[PDB]
Design a protein around this ligand. Structure first.
Ligand SMILES: [Mn+2]
Ligand SMILES: [Mn+2]
Ligand SMILES: [Mn+2]
Ligand SMILES: [Mn+2]
Ligand SMILES: [Mn+2]
Ligand code: NA
Length: 347
DNA sequence: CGCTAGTCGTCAT
DNA sequence: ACGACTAGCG
């Protein structure tokens, strides 16, 4: 996520209703609904007691989409990405602490604090996601487990023309080059839509409304793949990209101190990290549902060697990627947990 | 003031 | 999976 991006480009946002896409196709960042839904039954998930409330929670939204004539495609997060594994280690750690503290509060008799700790120690397994998958399947609603981050998969579905809008709470989708994104959608269908073409409504952006520059800005501000330099957020990044139409981005980043009129030490490692982050936003492996095969989010340019892009996702055999996408193969154990076959969104 | 860096909140009775 | 909010920084 790009911290403070939505408020930064607020002027490009538009209050809408899902009817806007009546009869069209919309992909969903389902893990948001999964988190928000799992919060409702946090204590049960923490205790280990069986639950299925989040299933219904998601199904409210799914059914609401179906009633308005929308064709939803529930997309799920798959394998851990190396570029993001750092953050995966931190969040997983936090949960652990909150799982202890909470239990520690159950022994001390404190119940409110214990619930406030349980509500911040929730981890969405593939088992839960697969529950949601079966539930949605039993409705004719297609599902698709991304090779890695759902962000990239959604971005692909949107750019390929397979879907017209993306329902999510995450702003990263904009940096991945999505066309239309629907944020903060409630159970009734009311949300904020941000169109890529309307980025020019934001005065603050200036000439930074092109996909490449926008991406560079999002990375420079501080993203999941790379923490920003000290004292740098969206404003300064946007300012840098504004004042500099260089446009070799490396030289600009090396002259960030010059463009911002402030002393900034830029390590050689941060440049390589920036390249890695950029390449991750560009070429993260996704799954083509039609051709049924692993592909990067964008076609490999001439100025990049795919061999050096392991952090952006490792390739596996197309059959395995298919089995993961269908939700048949579990993410962690790599174990066949279901047998679904659509032959007996695709083709 | 503008801006960035951390601590809290998402559910739902 | 994330964002909103704000105290305190320059
Ligand atoms: Mn509750
Ligand atoms: Mn994999
Ligand atoms: Mn995960
Ligand atoms: Mn995501
Ligand atoms: Mn993201
Ligand atoms: Na930052």
């Amino acid at each position: 996520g790009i911290q403070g991006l939505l408020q930064f480009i607020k002027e490009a946002s538009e209050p809408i209703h899902v009817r806007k896409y009546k009869g069209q196709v919309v992909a969903v960042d389902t893990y948001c609904w999964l988190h928000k839904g799992a919060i409702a039954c946090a204590e049960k998930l923490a205790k280990g007691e069986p639950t299925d409330r989040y299933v219904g929670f998601c199904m409210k939204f799914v059914n609401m989409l179906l009633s308005h004539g929308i064709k939803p495609i529930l997309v799920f997060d798959g394998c851990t990405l190396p570029s993001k594994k750092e953050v995966e280690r931190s969040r997983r750690e936090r949960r652990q602490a909150n799982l202890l503290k909470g239990k520690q509060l159950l022994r001390e008799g404190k119940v409110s604090e214990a619930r406030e700790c349980f509500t911040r120690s929730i981890n969405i397994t593939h088992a839960m996601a697969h529950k949601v998958i079966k539930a949605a399947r039993s409705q004719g609603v297609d599902c698709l487990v991304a090779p890695y981050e759902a962000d990239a998969q959604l971005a692909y579905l949107n750019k390929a023309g397979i879907v017209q809008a993306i329902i999510t709470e995450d702003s990263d989708l904009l940096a991945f080059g999505c066309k239309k994104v629907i944020l903060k959608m409630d159970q009734f269908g009311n949300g904020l839509e941000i169109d890529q073409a309307r980025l020019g409504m934001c005065r603050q952006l200036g000439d930074v409304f092109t996909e490449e520059k926008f991406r560079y800005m999002c990375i420079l501000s501080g993203c999941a793949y790379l923490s920003s330099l000290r004292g740098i957020g969206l404003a300064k990044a946007c300012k840098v990209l504004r004042l500099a139409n260089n446009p070799d981005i490396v030289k600009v980043i090396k002259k960030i101190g010059h463009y911002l009129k402030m002393n900034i030490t830029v390590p050689e490692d941060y440049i390589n990290g920036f390249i890695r982050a950029n390449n991750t936003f560009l070429y993260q492996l996704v799954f083509d549902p039609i051709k049924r095969k692993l592909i990067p989010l964008n076609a490999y340019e001439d100025d990049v060697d795919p061999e050096t892009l392991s952090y952006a996702g490792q390739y596996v055999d197309d059959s395995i990627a298919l089995q993961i996408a269908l939700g048949n193969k579990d993410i962690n154990t790599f174990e066949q947990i279901d047998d679904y076959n659509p032959d007996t969104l695709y083709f």
